[PDB]
Amino acid sequence: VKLKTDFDNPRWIKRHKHMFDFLDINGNGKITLDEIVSKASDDICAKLEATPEQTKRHQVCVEAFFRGCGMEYGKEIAFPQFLDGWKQLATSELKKWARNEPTLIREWGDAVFDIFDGTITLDEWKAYGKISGISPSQEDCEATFRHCDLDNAGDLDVDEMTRQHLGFWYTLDPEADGLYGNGVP
Ligand SMILES: O=C1N2C=C(c3ccc(O)cc3)N=C(Cc3ccccc3)C2=N[C@@]1(Cc1ccc(O)cc1)OO
Numbered sequence: 001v002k003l004k005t006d007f008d009n010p011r012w013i014k015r016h017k018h019m020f021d022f023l024d025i026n027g028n029g030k031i032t033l034d035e036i037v038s039k040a041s042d043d044i045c046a047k048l049e050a051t052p053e054q055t056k057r058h059q060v061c062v063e064a065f066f067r068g069c070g071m072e073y074g075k076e077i078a079f080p081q082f083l084d085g086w087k088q089l090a091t092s093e094l095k096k097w098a099r100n101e102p103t104l105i106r107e108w109g110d111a112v113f114d115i116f117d118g119t120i121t122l123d124e125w126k127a128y129g130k131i132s133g134i135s136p137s138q139e140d141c142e143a144t145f146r147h148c149d150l151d152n153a154g155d156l157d158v159d160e161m162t163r164q165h166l167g168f169w170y171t172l173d174p175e176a177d178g179l180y181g182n183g184v185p
Pocket residue numbers: 015016017019020036037039040044062105106108109110112132134158161162165169
């Protein structure tokens with residue numbers, strides 16, 4: 001995994017601007033943790049028929065993850081502050097990675113994969129792409145599976161998706177480009 005960050009690269013800025021705008025469903029330039037956690041729990045976990053325990057675990061992981069980029073309940077965050085939060089989160093996560101401490105993105109991944117049970121099939125990923133809305137095109141979800149190193153069944157493991165996520169969200173690793181097909185630049 002490419003470990004050096006690239007926070008001034010316009011492509012890294014654009015990646016997160018795309019995601020911010022995707023979360024800013026009402027187009028008012030600000031998002032809150034409340035909205036993110038409702039998306040996680042009331043929308044995604046409900047549609048995935050997660051158990052109450054799984055929903056709660058996933059919520060704790062989403063809360064931790066987005067608190068790591070500066071989000072908080074009731075705190076209206078616009079994109080520049082959000083991105084500064086992501087620089088902090090990425091930095092912290094890479095330190096955890098280096099010291100063999102589980103990352104917040106790994107723990108969120110554990111919670112997502114457990115709802116789908118540490119492997120996800122392509123059909124499960126296609127459903128996630130639609131339900132979370134991050135990648136509603138099934139072709140882009142096929143791209144994810146082509147892109148990643150899959151297990152012997154052609155399923156995706158959380159170790160691999162975690163490595164890919166480090167490169168995609170944190171370091172702009174060329175080896176992670178295309179993780180979400182054309183769904184996320
Ligand atoms: O990584 C992921 N995400 C990153 C961002 C995101 C949001 C803002 C940014 O600036 C950058 C990235 N938004 C969402 C979708 C989501 C957002 C909010 C609440 C619930 C879900 C999202 N879903 C994940 C979940 C996941 C995590 C680990 C795995 O191993 C597998 C799957 O897979 O794509």
